[PDB]
Write a protein that binds this ligand. Structure first.
Ligand SMILES: COc1cc(C(=O)NCCCN2CCN(C)CC2)ccc1NC(=O)c1csc2c(=O)[nH]cnc12
Length: 295
């Protein structure tokens, strides 16, 4: 994949937007375009930069961030800027938070799965992301388009049990993360927020078979897919190609996914009545459109 060698003098650094897995991300300008720059912190991070640069150049897909080029003094990546920020901020960030619909929730998960399915179908060997979570999912086009970034080649809430076991893992670990993200956008809750302390407490819980609470009034095909994705045995989880197909076909019953995020939302989180939670999104329209198609 062809890419530019950037002269640092052509870069005009504006403001710091965030701090990813490694390095610092900053808003900037380069040749009229609005860009984002991931810059090195410690000289030790150099190995991670070679990996991410090797991979981002190799990949080309609408749901994975564009790499425009790389500057080597100082060593930094020049990528496309995501105007809407991360999904984590949209979900759980500072007030005021945007209102979103079930349609948005489904579309975000579809676009995410589409990007991952592409990664799993690389030649000659598949790419495993290893770090799928809302902080690494970015939003553009008024919140309607999702991009994947921060390749994994505080993540315990999304991590498959075989990964933190140090055990042998396949691309099916990405599928587990996707299941958690799906639960997360439907409920607008932080997964395992009730479990306090440090990371090992989550890891212990998930290792015993602790999963997120089931959702009240959730459509059985969605529930079926969600719980399949978070199976202990990686074999019992569906492939991403299957997920992409299912989610594409469900979008028939979720119109309006192309409406930009623009409405305010004052969000208070109720407690879980039984062992279940109420969704943030509403499924009344789904059931209406479904019954119209089915008998
Ligand atoms: C997560 O990083 C971002 C935050 C905000 C963001 O939230 N914007 C700044 C908020 C401005 N505030 C100021 C205060 N005001 C009251 C509200 C608006 C906007 C854009 C980001 N990232 C990228 O474009 C990006 C491109 S590639 C890449 C990567 O590999 N890793 C992490 N990020 C990126």
């Amino acid at each position: 994949g062809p890419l530019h060698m950037i002269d640092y003098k052509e870069i005009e650094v504006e403001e710091v937007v965030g701090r990813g897995a490694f390095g610092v991300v900053c808003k900037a300008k380069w040749r009229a375009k609005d860009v984002a720059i991931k810059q090195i912190e410690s000289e030790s991070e150099r190995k991670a930069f070679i990996v991410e640069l090797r991979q981002l150049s190799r990949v080309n897909h609408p749901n994975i961030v564009k790499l425009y080029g790389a500057c080597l003094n100082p060593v930094c990546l020049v990528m496309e800027y995501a105007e809407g920020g991360s999904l984590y901020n949209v979900l759980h960030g500072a007030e005021p938070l945007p209102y979103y619909t079930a349609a948005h929730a489904m579309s975000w998960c579809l676009q995410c799965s589409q990007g991952v399915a592409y990664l799993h179908s690389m030649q000659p060997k598949a790419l495993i992301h290893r770090d799928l979570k809302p902080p690494n999912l970015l939003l553009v086009a008024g919140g309607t388009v999702l991009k994947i970034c921060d390749f994994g080649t505080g993540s315990a809430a999304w991590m498959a049990p075989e990964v933190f076991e140090g055990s042998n893992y396949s691309e099916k670990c990405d599928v587990f993360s996707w299941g958690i993200i799906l639960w997360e956008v439907i409920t607008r809750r932080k997964p395992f927020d009730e479990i306090g302390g440090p990371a090992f407490r989550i890891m212990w819980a998930v290792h015993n078979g602790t999963r997120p609470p089931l959702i009240k009034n959730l459509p059985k095909p969605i529930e079926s897919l969600m719980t399949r994705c978070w199976s202990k045995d990686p074999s019992q989880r569906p492939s991403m190609e299957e997920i992409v197909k299912i989610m594409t076909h469900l979008m028939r019953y979720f119109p309006g996914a192309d409406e930009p995020l623009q409405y305010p939302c004052q969000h208070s989180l109720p407690p879980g009545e039984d062992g279940r939670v109420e969704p943030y999104v509403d499924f009344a329209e789904f059931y209406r459109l479904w019954s119209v198609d089915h008998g």
